[PDB]
């Protein structure tokens, strides 16, 4: 019932060259939202670079500059921070490793230390804390195994205990939440199915039940929400679709309706995508719009891994391609 209605002058074509221009210029124009989002800069860099690579435009960003920035974000404990002077966290450790993987530049950082850092954050029940202050979230289970998979070091953690924690987070509706007892949400479902793909445990997911819950995310507008009774948001065209793809149920979505919703979220003047038609654009939604379209089979965009949200050609290069359902 809660839905957007798309206006009839909404973009209905993919504006690839504008999106590359928007990203290539981003953080160049003291900008307010730039300044203010410094706490997630490393992930912001990952979003920009990955989308540029999916569009074949990676070369237009600054490799040398980014490698030095990453190197300067690794702390003595081995963890990576969002930006210089900020504190290390598993979120930004994953983003940095994803970036270095895109650039085939992994030994820009100390890999042994990243591994020891991730290892140190695992708790007795198999969960992962995000950092030393102990916040537990299935988001961090995914960051840990995704980081380690990309580095070839999955054996460094207690995998069975990790699987057991994640499965304890599975709910009556087939979905997953942040912690045991937490309500299902597409973002968490993405993290947990991504985790179960990497660790080879997708047979423990009820694909028909979860797939149903996921495809019921699609509203009459064609857009997807993250949980029942919420507004659609273009980034759920990543969280929900990637999960559906991982569990073999991507065809349970109406693909043309979602595609029309994603394209309507483009800003035809500035480029970029907003969370919903007519809102302000940002690089986060630009990546997830474009990545969503790639999952739907868009020819102008490179195939994207539903597990790692990176070009599949990159993961083929490092030989890390989990089997999906």
């Amino acid at each position: 019932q809660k839905d957007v209605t798309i206006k009839s002058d909404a973009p209905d074509t993919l504006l690839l060259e504008k999106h590359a221009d928007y990203i290539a210029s981003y953080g160049s124009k003291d900008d307010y939202e730039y300044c203010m989002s410094e706490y997630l800069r490393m992930s912001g860099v990952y979003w920009g670079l990955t989308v540029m690579d999916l569009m074949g435009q990676l070369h237009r960003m600054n490799k040398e500059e980014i490698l030095v920035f990453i190197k300067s974000c690794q702390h003595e404990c081995g963890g990576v921070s969002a930006s210089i002077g900020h504190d290390p966290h598993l979120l930004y450790t994953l983003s940095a490793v994803q970036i270095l993987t895109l650039y085939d530049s992994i030994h820009v950082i100390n890999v042994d230390k990243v591994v020891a850092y991730v290892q140190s954050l695992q708790k007795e029940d198999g969960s992962f804390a995000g950092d030393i202050w102990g916040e537990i979230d299935t988001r961090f289970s995914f960051c840990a195994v995704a980081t380690l998979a990309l580095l070839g070091k999955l054996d460094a953690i207690n995998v069975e205990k990790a699987i057991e924690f994640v499965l304890s987070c599975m709910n009556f509706d087939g979905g997953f939440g942040c912690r045991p007892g937490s309500e299902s949400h597409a973002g968490q479902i993405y993290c947990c199915t991504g985790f179960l793909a990497i660790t080879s445990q997708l047979h423990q997911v009820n694909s028909d039940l979860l797939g149903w819950w996921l495809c019921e995310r699609q509203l009459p507008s064609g857009g997807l929400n993250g949980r029942p009774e919420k507004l659609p948001d273009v980034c759920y065209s990543w969280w929900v679709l990637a999960s559906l793809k991982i569990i073999g149920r991507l065809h349970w979505i109406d693909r043309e309706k979602l595609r029309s919703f994603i394209l309507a979220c483009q800003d035809e003047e500035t480029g970029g995508f907003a969370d919903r038609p007519g809102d302000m654009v940002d690089p986060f939604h630009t990546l997830f719009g474009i990545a969503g379209l790639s999952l739907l089979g868009e020819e102008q965009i490179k195939p994207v891994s539903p597990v790692f949200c990176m070009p599949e050609e990159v993961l083929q290069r490092v030989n890390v391609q989990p089997e999906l359902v």
Partner: protein, 313 residues
């Protein structure tokens, strides 16, 4: 960021944020772990609660001051911290950092007023019954205070009857019921009481997708068919006819059509084969976005039917 609809004061707020951020980091490198810090970060965390490093700084400061202050001074500090947290949650109740810092803080106190924390929860949940950060915190508080599964079940009932937006309260019930059961999926008498509670909900508001999701789980949580008791059989047949009535009143309602198919499965797959197939065609016409799912569901049931007929003597 989200929900941002398509200057001068913005440039002044930024220069103040930058200067204070600047100042906190210098103070931190200098090892100045003091109340001025707390003052500086309060100015930033208020508007910008996802700046995690500044929560870490507050923690480093509070940790340090616990050593080099008296107990009464330390107690005054934690009370100030609790007030600050509450004012942050009023402006932004959906920040991971704020809720986590509140838990960190409460976990290290000896003795926290947990009943006060449960009441904070009830207030935030009146404002937004779907706020998952607040339900997570409530589960945290209930565990720390050893609140019984039966008390929380009583809390969920008030929430489902007083208004809709019930997905989070039904979810909570699905976790609580197995607990006061417990077992090593639901006993029949418990299940029957829940079927009655959920069926009230969906005839009160047939729109109301949360009760239908919960009801589908209840239909699978039984000892099953055919160990169908005469009471459960009767209950499910009466649900079937009530859904058919609702179908007349609301012919565009996809949830009641799906539920009819599901109930027929629960009752007798082969006996209702013809009606089941009829219902799929009506459903696909009513919910065409789900056509692919519905064809796959129907294929699964038709395969199950084939297996049921091959089991014949």
């Amino acid at each position: 960021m989200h929900g941002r609809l398509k200057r001068l004061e913005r440039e002044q707020k930024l220069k103040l944020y930058q200067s204070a951020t600047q100042a906190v980091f210098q103070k931190r490198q200098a090892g100045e772990l003091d109340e001025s810090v707390l003052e500086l970060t309060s100015q930033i965390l208020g508007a910008n609660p996802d700046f995690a490093t500044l929560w870490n700084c507050r923690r480093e400061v509070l940790q340090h001051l616990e050593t080099e202050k008296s107990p009464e001074e330390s107690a005054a500090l934690v009370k100030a911290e609790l007030g600050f947290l509450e004012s942050c949650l009023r402006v932004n109740p959906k920040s991971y950092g704020t809720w986590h810092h509140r838990c960190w803080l409460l976990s290290r106190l000896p003795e926290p007023n947990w009943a006060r924390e449960l009441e904070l929860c009830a207030r935030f949940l009146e404002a937004d019954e779907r706020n998952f950060h607040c339900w997570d915190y409530r589960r945290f508080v209930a565990a720390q205070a050893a609140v019984a599964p039966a008390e929380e079940l009583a809390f969920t009932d008030s929430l489902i009857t007083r208004n809709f937006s019930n997905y989070s309260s039904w979810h909570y019930r699905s976790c609580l019921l197995p607990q006061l059961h417990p077992q090593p999926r639901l006993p029949e008498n418990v299940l029957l009481k829940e079927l009655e509670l959920v069926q009230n909900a969906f005839f009160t508001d047939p729109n109301d997708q949360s009760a239908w999701f919960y009801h589908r789980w209840l239909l699978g949580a039984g000892s099953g068919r055919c160990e169908l008791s005469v009471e459960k059989s009767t209950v499910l047949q009466s649900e079937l006819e009530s859904c058919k009535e609702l179908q007349e009143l609301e012919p565009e309602n996809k949830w009641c059509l799906l539920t009819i198919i599901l109930l027929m499965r629960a009752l007798d797959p082969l006996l209702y084969e013809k009606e089941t197939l009829q219902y799929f065609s009506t459903l696909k016409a009513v919910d065409p976005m789900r056509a692919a799912y519905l064809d796959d569901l129907r294929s699964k049931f038709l395969l199950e039917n084939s297996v049921l007929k091959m089991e014949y003597a």
